[PDB]
Amino acid sequence: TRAKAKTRSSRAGLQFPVGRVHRLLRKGNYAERVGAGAPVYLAAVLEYLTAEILELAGNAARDNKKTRIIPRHLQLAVRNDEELNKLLGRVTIAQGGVLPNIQSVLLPKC
Amino acid sequence: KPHRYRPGTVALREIRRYQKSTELLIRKLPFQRLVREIAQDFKTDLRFQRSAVMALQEASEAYLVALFEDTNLCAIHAKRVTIMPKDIQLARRIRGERA
Amino acid sequence: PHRYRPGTVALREIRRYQKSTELLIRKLPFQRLVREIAQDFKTDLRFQRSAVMALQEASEAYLVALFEDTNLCAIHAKRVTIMPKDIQLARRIRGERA
Amino acid sequence: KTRKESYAIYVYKVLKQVHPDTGISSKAMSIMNSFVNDVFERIAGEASRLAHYNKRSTITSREIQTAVRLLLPGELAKHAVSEGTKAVTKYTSAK
């Protein structure tokens, strides 16, 4: 037969399923055909985005001295970043709460 | 003689408490009953999953809170502290909901 | 001599410009600005004749709709003069500023 | 039986690679899976529209990179595309 099989994710140096992304692109009929490098690029971009979001969430969680990431930390990490907030501008997160902030005029003076 | 808090400063403690927390604020049973009552007109004898009603709770609460953020902006703009229904209406109009 | 009361010619201009549908921004300065702003993104860019017209006409509609919203903010604050804070708050509520 | 495809294991793997001493809740994992699916759908739809732009019936890395550039705002895009390029320039290096 053939040699020992090994996943395309290992070739691309990712742990995201480039094969599953390719299958989803094929079965999602976005285009008649999909290139070989398109699933690799999509998996890499998804990996980078989720890595940044998870790193910010973990940083917020360790700030709140809570080592388990809960949905509350996700908004604290996403909305505190302007670029990520712009990316998720029309996105609501369940059990995310709101950012603690009060308008300056509402605060009492000296 | 009894201890009394000056008005307007308990509201700051309340604002901090409800902004720090993340749980639901509307009671679950009245909201579920309202959802059934408003959906029964579109299709009689309907059925909702437990997650279906809860999903409507999170969507409604996020929308209502976000609207109140914009409503406060309008009320603050008019050089006042309280919020009027006209603040809500103008916030909806600028967003494009009631244009 | 004759002199209109300050504030009535403004309604005349409002009615004249709302009834009409021409382009209120001079075409050559807007095209020059478009070329300058697109020069930074990619040098040596050519613009179609109808590309700039679409760019300017779409840009004009956004500004006009923005001024409708910022006019609403001015009246809501019990005024008639639109101010920079009116534009800023209208943009913030619209979701563009933040 | 009745298996359900999800990005849970991959999200956990990248979480452990970026923070080797923390956990994640089930609801947080579901939110992350939904976010990954939504971003995948958005980028793939933009790539499909860009393919339909130039009467092209195929999807390549070029237009998915262009779609990522269009979608992701500011510095984020300048990162992501670069990352994507890496994942390609080594993929063709070793087969």
């Binding site: 302007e82 950012l99 | - | - | 923070h19």
Partner: peptide, 23 residues
Amino acid sequence: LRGGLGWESSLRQRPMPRLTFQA
């Protein structure tokens, strides 16, 4: 900074914070 273990380099050092315009 940023990075961390297997994510050396990459990421987004010094990300832009939210503005939260005040009236």
